[PDB]
C-alpha cells in the first residue's frame, strides 16, 4: 500500500473540460442576468487549456440541449484521456442548477459518468465544478477568539459555496470562487496536488467579503467553498 500513490496522468490527452455558461434565463424564471459570467468562462478556458485540457464551451443551453450534450460526451470514448472536467456557471438552489429554461438536479448530470455508465473513465478523475447559489442563507462574518472499483468512485465535486448558501459574483471580474480558482490554477495548477490547491481556494474565498452593497444588511457577508472527494489517489497536473 503506497500512501503516495498518484493517478496515472500519462495518457496521450489530458482530456475534455466542458463549460456550461449561463448568463440569461427564460423570462418566466424571474432570474436576474449573471453579468461577469463570460469573464469566468474565458478565465477558466485559459487556465484549463494551459493544463492541457481540450476546452469546449456552451452558452445558455436549454435543459434538453444541455442533457443531450452531456449524454454525448459521456458516451464518446475517454480511453486515451487522463480525466474529465465539467464546469457549470449559473444560478441554482437546493441540489440543482439552472439551464436557460429549467432546473436540472446535479445528480442527473453526474450519474451519466458513473463507472457502469462510462467505462472509459473508470479509474479516472471525474471533476465537476459548480459556480451557483445553493440556497437562501447569506453567510455572516465571524472572528476567532481482485480489486474491482465502485461505480461511484473517483469523482471530485467542487462547489463555490457550502450547502444552502448564496454565492457571490462581481459584475466585471467574475465570481469570487472562479477568480480565486483560476488564480490558484495559474500559480500552482501544474505543481500542487489538486485537493491541496482547492483548499487554498477555500482560504482565498473565505477572506473576501461584500465590501459595498445597496442592501446595507448584506455588507460584510461571506462565503466558504466546499469540495467533496471520492478520489482514491493523489491528483496532479504536471506538464504533459
Amino acid at each position: 500500500f503506497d500512501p503516495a500513490e498518484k493517478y496515472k496522468m500519462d495518457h496521450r490527452r489530458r482530456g475534455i473540460a466542458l463549460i456550461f455558461n449561463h448568463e440569461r434565463f427564460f423570462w418566466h424564471l424571474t432570474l436576474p442576468e449573471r453579468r461577469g459570467t463570460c469573464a469566468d468562462r474565458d478565465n477558466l478556458t485559459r487556465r484549463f487549456s494551459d493544463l492541457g485540457f481540450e476546452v469546449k464551451c456552451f452558452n445558455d443551453l436549454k435543459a434538453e440541449e444541455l442533457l443531450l450534450k452531456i449524454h454525448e460526451v459521456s458516451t464518446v470514448s475517454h480511453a486515451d484521456a487522463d480525466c474529465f472536467v465539467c464546469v457549470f456557471l449559473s444560478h441554482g438552489e437546493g441540489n440543482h442548477i439552472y439551464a436557460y429554461d429549467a432546473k436540472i438536479e446535479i445528480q442527473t448530470l453526474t450519474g451519466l459518468f458513473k463507472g457502469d455508465k462510462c467505462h472509459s473513465l473508470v479509474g479516472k478523475p471525474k471533476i465537476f465544478i459548480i459556480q451557483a447559489c445553493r440556497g437562501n442563507q447569506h453567510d455572516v462574518p465571524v472572528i476567532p477568539l481482485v480489486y474491482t472499483l465502485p461505480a461511484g468512485a473517483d469523482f471530485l465535486m467542487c462547489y463555490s459555496v457550502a450547502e444552502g448558501y448564496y454565492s457571490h459574483r462581481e459584475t466585471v471580474n467574475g465570481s469570487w470562487y472562479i477568480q480565486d480558482l483560476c488564480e490558484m490554477l495559474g500559480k500552482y495548477g501544474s505543481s500542487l496536488e489538486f485537493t491541496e490547491l482547492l483548499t487554498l481556494v477555500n482560504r482565498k474565498v473565505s477572506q473576501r467579503r461584500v465590501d459595498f452593497c445597496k442592501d446595507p444588511s448584506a455588507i460584510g457577508k461571506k462565503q466558504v467553498p466546499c469540495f467533496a472527494s471520492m478520489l482514491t489517489k493523489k491528483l496532479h497536473f504536471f506538464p504533459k
Binding site: 444560478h91 447569506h138 463555490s160 454565492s167 461584500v210
Partner: peptide
C-alpha cells in the same frame, strides 16, 4: 457584487 451580485448574488448567484
Amino acid at each position: 457584487v451580485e448574488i448567484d
